């Protein structure tokens, strides 16, 4: 051992530098590795109470009505309107 042997003891020292350097990298990977680890991972969102939903539950009928096809004018009435004694004619 380096105990009772200074001519190894005294070159261990010497490359106790070396070896602060090894020790350097443990502090350098902090600042390196835990240093980058920003991550802002929060999309906790547990609300029930929340319009989170693309399904006419509540109605049920409206949807099969219109078959939720048309996010402009859904199929809502049953009415021959602006289309008695014109348009199916002639085209007039």
Do not use: C, F, W, Y
Request: hydrophobic content about 30%; proline content about 5%; glycine content about 6%.
């Amino acid at each position: 051992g380096a105990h009772m042997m200074q001519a190894r003891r005294e070159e261990l020292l010497a490359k106790k530098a070396r070896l602060a350097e090894i020790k350097r990298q443990r502090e350098l990977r902090a600042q390196q590795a835990a240093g980058r680890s920003i991550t802002p991972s929060e999309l906790v969102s547990p609300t029930p109470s929340r319009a989170n939903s693309r399904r006419e539950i509540e109605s049920l009928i409206d949807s099969i009505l219109s078959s939720s096809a048309g996010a402009n004018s859904p199929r809502r009435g049953s009415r021959p309107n602006s289309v008695i004694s014109t348009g199916e004619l002639s085209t007039d």
